[PDB]
């Protein structure tokens, strides 16, 4: 039991002064001057904002990938998220091609058991068969999964060509699941990788050039039009480019339910990082899609302000220096990914709220609420109201923090925002009504987190069903 | 006290089964299986949706205009809104040029005392001076006004040119008031009127021709760029054209807070109505901006679906055949306006929700919540939650109604949708906790409604303030 | 706008020939041979007195009371007032014991929405608690209330005992509010009722005997000495007895601000009405305090001439024959109250001015100006001057009226001055600058009236503050 | 022309912030921020109260009386008033017995010529005849007299017995004039003087004992009951006693128009002053009626608070020590009279307003407005309104003054309030639009004052006529 007193509550749509009482993992009461019940502890939020805790819908804790295993595991990752105000995640079960989805699912459940805060899974469709379709049904009905990931890159690995995307998206529709997509054209990437390697361009500066922005635009257009065609919603992960974002706006402008995710890295970093002359420094930044020329960062902010990008995530996929160095003589073999779970909320607040680019309300929407609506977890999560999960962050608008690999809780030796100072930080993080992060002190305990099931058929399927019924074809009499 | 039992509650975000208890003007409790307190009636809403009652932010009850007085008054018009599910209105105080705003405000407050449902005012800036600027402050500080209308058409009457728009918008920023605008280029309208009359085209068929869609798009661009330049939000009334909508989309794509209102008539009728062979019929459709060719309807529906249009309203401004007939020999003298307060919600439900263009949540957002947020009345209005005003509509998705001047409650002899049959209707309407419409029985009572005051500084001005500091000029030294 | 021409202006202090221009709710100009602005209507007031319209600070429109509801509602009652030259009222919010003051105020505000002329509210303190005290402060700071009513009668219902009277009067002093009192000793009344009923004396003739004059004198004494002890002003409603009037005179002769109100009915009728041979007719007169032996009348006229009574009112509280008949076998169950709003001015004029007891100036003082000063509405009301509200009555000293239920506009089947003919009548009544009564034609409109907010700390509080300083207790050292 | 800027206007009934513009002897405008018209001087009234100038309706400038002539003359007396905030006086024409009234009038007009501020006369009826009766008519019709003084004391000089009172009062009624009376029983005074002196009690301490309070109460009773009987108003000068005040209260409580004037001396001093061991000090206080035992002072304050005393004045009748000393061996030969014209307003303000005994509005009523109303000069005087005479005083509540014969401007060697310190004083005094007292400086000019006519029939005669219509006695037939 925990009563937060004196703060201003801030939701995705309003702000008001009120105390919030938590017990048994839930919000119990919200109102002015509530009394403390005996047993309960008190937290003074005077001068602070109390917001729904962050949901990071894009994590890869201890992912085996590109020859190795991410250096952050489910506990260290989730604990670091907590230190940064993030209170739940959604990670990805990634079966190898031809591996049973269910078997990969149970393996991933075993790995995620050590989570310190709430977690769930998307499941990736890395090959296709009747078995796959059947196992998707089983995951939805029995394992609380309602979203499936598709990768349009990684040729001769896990790439889904059209036949798969069509068949899988069709199945998603049958199941009321949300297809999500990593959108980059895998043929062009493969092709550009070979050509650049053949020219002797082997360093990280080659990485951006192996996948310039139109490669992402193309795949997005494609995913979106497959989606339009089969009558499914669509969530595109890590949008980095104007081209991809413009495809998103074009589709929403026709009334299509398409949602975009953006990472802080793509909002704040440009592709000059990859030309850095220290190898390890430049490789620190190697992720897909890569950081982009500067005109792209402002397009993405505009996307957030105009309602064409809807959520923020980190794609938290950590590799240490020695692991990155696997691609020392071949950039295509640098394990791809950057850390960011701890730093998402602060970076977005600092660059977005302080600048007056975003409101506090949009900050909540973009850090928790939209993700929760999209994946059918609202108002269980991403909401301050009676009966909702007690996942909250007490935000100190004038608190200072300098981001650094020497000081972060992320178990990785590199921070893409090394040396950056932000104003506005999580002074306290509450998960399941417990205080897990309190002014410098992290109290994450392995296994405290719960697996979060997400029901099928978010509400967008209502609307889609009325549309499909309205446009059912009818034969000419004769 | 009134208990609405057995319905599905539908808000701007979600749908869930619960009972809602109203008393003393407010929603007191929401939940399943609520007990009936002693002395409270019960309403059975099984198989029905219970939604916030509609807010129509654009009405002109008993307006004196174009040489006469609108045939619907504040009583009959609010009563008619109630019969159609609309529970509050915002109307316009329109001073003559050189007439004191406070004086016209007090005349309109006198006329509105007969309202049967909650009501409020925007106040129009029809001329400029220091005194006008002073009176604006007093209206905001003392009389619950937080928005000011400007007309960009009506040359040689109430048109505001650039010098007034600039001075007034600047005053709005200082006061935390939202500037709203009627966007048509008045010089062009004037020119084309003169020219059509010179050509010998004096009939109603000449009206759309006198104000083609680019005249709206120009003026929209202008007011929008003025707003951008001075750092204010902007609300555009009765957007009817692709051109204006495209200007709004363009502005919003750059992060600018621009809002757009649309009428059901502009969503559903085209300009063929002006060619009707019966003079009075043609004249009945005469309003500004006029009905447009079909491509514009489609573009406006997509606007609603993409979030570039935000509110619905009616521009409820009623004149009977004998009043319209004042322009018998000169289309420019036909009093401009049509009726719609009663029909807005069902028109929109029937066209948007049954077709699957809009979800029920977006219907709620477009008919109340968004208006409420924009004008700083949320969650007092547009919300089903404890403490909120008990303004509600119970909606029968299988009910039917044919729109007709023979049977509508609007005190006017013409309906622009004569003969249209809708499916999905308001079975019951509740205002201030009272059952004012019940399945064919209208129980509106003169005077019952309250003047609704709207606090200044909706949250958008906070964001703008931070934005302004960030982008302030900095002198060169040295 | 309204030009009243050729009348003699009669105020609380002077009479002079002048024309009076009304526009925008207010008196715009006063002067000899004013010019008629175009659009303005002219009212010919030749040979008439133009006085401030009547204020009746004691009404109970549609009161639920003694197991029923008054037959006059806020529209019918205020329309009737207007026809009788009365242009505004103060009515009473009467919470049930243990009911929130705010909740009652809100209910009453909704019932008064239908009022046709300006109206206000006193709020009754019918029980006591910290929350009552808080609510009193809120009514005063936000809801325009500056007077609180207490009942010393009605044992075992809403009686305020001495602990409540002290606690409330002290709270009124804190808030700059005026305490008002219904002064009868509830315990004596309770006791005499039981006694008379046990003797089998069940008819209306018992009603006066159940509450003889000394019961009023005692309560008045008590409320006055409480007020004196705590340092507050005091207003005593409906003074009917020599004894209570002598208590007011005694207090005032020691420099205490005590005000007294009187009804025309206690000026003009005596207790023989209760021995009427027709049950229903005797019952028609039952109100509290009841009508008195005849020497009380003459004492009250003298109160008015000496400045020991200050206001006139009606305690307008209407019950039809059927409702009175609820006490057919038990006088204590006959609903208490009589009608008067329409008749007060003419009755006072005819008995007071025509006989020469009172000057015309005293008549204005007693009918509007004093009430206005006492409750902090002077000179907004009860004054003829530029800028005051245009609430005016045009009084024809040669006119004549026979009072009758058959023709009065009060919605009740009984008039306590049935068959009385008066000389000097209101020919026209103007409220908010509109002509609402005119030579026999009532043109009152539902809802037209406005809620009139009354500020705290009328000027008697400055004097009491300096008194209190001079009387401060000085300690002796240790 | 004089603009008085930034003061708070204080009247007999309200206060409000406004400037006041005077020109041509008159108030021209009253409003917030008035422009200084050219030619006009400006007076900074910031932080001060602007009030109608005092009217002293009881002065005896250079009166021949008790074998000598009053040491103050019309110029020095009116000058002194100005310095004390008094702007107009009413003095007395006192003809000798058998002397023509017109004759004494013209002499007194010659005397009053030198006045520095506005002045008028009452005329004393010191004997009776058909000629006296005729001349009274002439004085009212041609010389702007509307009030006649009667002396009930001074046996064997100017005393009017009952037959003169009756005939003069009846004649006042025929002419529309107001009877005023010095009420002491002359026979009892004469007897007591004789008896005190035969006892050898020749000192000033015998002076009070020669005319104890009941001698005043008796004459007041008698004057009142004459007025009542003949149907006239009545103004009683210098009331000093409980007894007389109680007769006033009793008469007013029968609805009779009787007014009471009081002097600061009788509010503030007691009879112990006549016992001072120094002869000439004790003789300084000798006037009629004498100062009284302390209980009379609190009773008079209460008469003022209760509305049984109506005006303040001074009976300004100055004699120096050597003239007083004429009664060194015989108190009955001490010329009677004290000074106070200069001190009235400050004494009343300090003792009445600072104490919280009176409001500031009451202070204005008591120092000018009621006198004005009573003698038919309202609103020419005693009023702050457009068209009134610009007689005004600017009051500095924080100013201080110590009253001394050594420093006052009154041309007399004695001050009955020597050494008394007052808080609240007139800083500036304006008469006929001109600043005559300012910052400690007097600028009075001999002859500047005008003679002020008072028209007959003040409105009290309207009420009285209504009564006399109703007293038609009717013969018996059945
Ligand atoms: Zn990816
Ligand atoms: Zn990823
Ligand atoms: Zn418009
Ligand atoms: Zn409009
Ligand atoms: Zn009562
Ligand atoms: Zn009452
Ligand atoms: Zn005298
Ligand atoms: Zn005298």
Author numbering:
A (entry chain B), B (entry chain A), C (entry chain C), D (entry chain D): 2 to 479
The authors write:
Dihydropyrimidinase catalyzes the reversible cyclization of dihydrouracil to N-carbamoyl-β-alanine in the second step of the pyrimidine degradation pathway. Dihydropyrimidinase, hydantoinase, imidase, allantoinase, and dihydroorotase belong to the cyclic amidohydrolase family because of their functional and structural similarities. Most of the active sites of dihydropyrimidinases, hydantoinases, allantoinases, and dihydroorotases contain four histidines, one aspartate, and one carboxylated lysine residue, which are required for metal binding and catalytic activity. The global architecture of the dihydropyrimidinase monomer consists of two domains, namely, a large domain with a classic (β/α)8-barrel structure core embedding the catalytic dimetal center and a small β-sandwich domain.
To confirm this result and determine how this enzyme can also form a tetramer, we also determined the crystal structure of P. aeruginosa PAO1 dihydropyrimidinase at 2.17 Å resolution at acidic environment. Crystals of P. aeruginosa dihydropyrimidinase were grown at room temperature by hanging drop vapor diffusion in 10% PEG 8000, 100 mM HEPES, 200 mM calcium acetate, pH 5.9. The crystals of P. aeruginosa dihydropyrimidinase grown under this condition belonged to space group C2221 with cell dimensions of a = 108.9, b = 155.7, and c = 235.6 Å. An asymmetric unit of the crystal contained four crystallographically independent P. aeruginosa dihydropyrimidinase monomers, in which two zinc ions were found in the active site per monomer. Thus, P. aeruginosa dihydropyrimidinase did exist as a mixture of dimers and tetramers at pH 5.9. In the crystal of P. aeruginosa dihydropyrimidinase, the four molecules formed two pairs of dimers, B-A and C-D, respectively. We noted that in the crystal, another crystallographically related tetramer B-A-C′-D′ was formed and further stabilized via many hydrogen bonds and salt bridges. For the tetramer formation of P. aeruginosa dihydropyrimidinase, many hydrogen bonds with close distance were found: these bonds (<3 Å) include K374(A)–E14(B), H13(A)–E14(B), R386(A)–E14(B), R386(A)–E15(B), R467(A)–V354(B), R468(A)–G357(B), E14(A)–H13(B), E15(A)–R386(B), V354(A)–R467(B), G357(A)–R468(B), H13(C′)–E14(D′), R386(C′)–E15(D′), R468(C′)–G357(D′), E14(C′)–H13(D′), E14(C′)–K374(D′), E15(C′)–R386(D′), and G357(C′)–R468(D′); however, these residues were not found for the tetramer formation of Thermus sp. dihydropyrimidinase. Comparison by superimposition indicated that many Arg residues (R253, R358, R386, R467, and R468) found in P. aeruginosa dihydropyrimidinase, but not in Thermus sp. dihydropyrimidinase, may play a crucial role for the pH-dependent oligomerization. On the basis of these results, we concluded that P. aeruginosa dihydropyrimidinase could form a tetramer, but its oligomerization mechanism differed from those of other dihydropyrimidinases such as Thermus sp. dihydropyrimidinase.
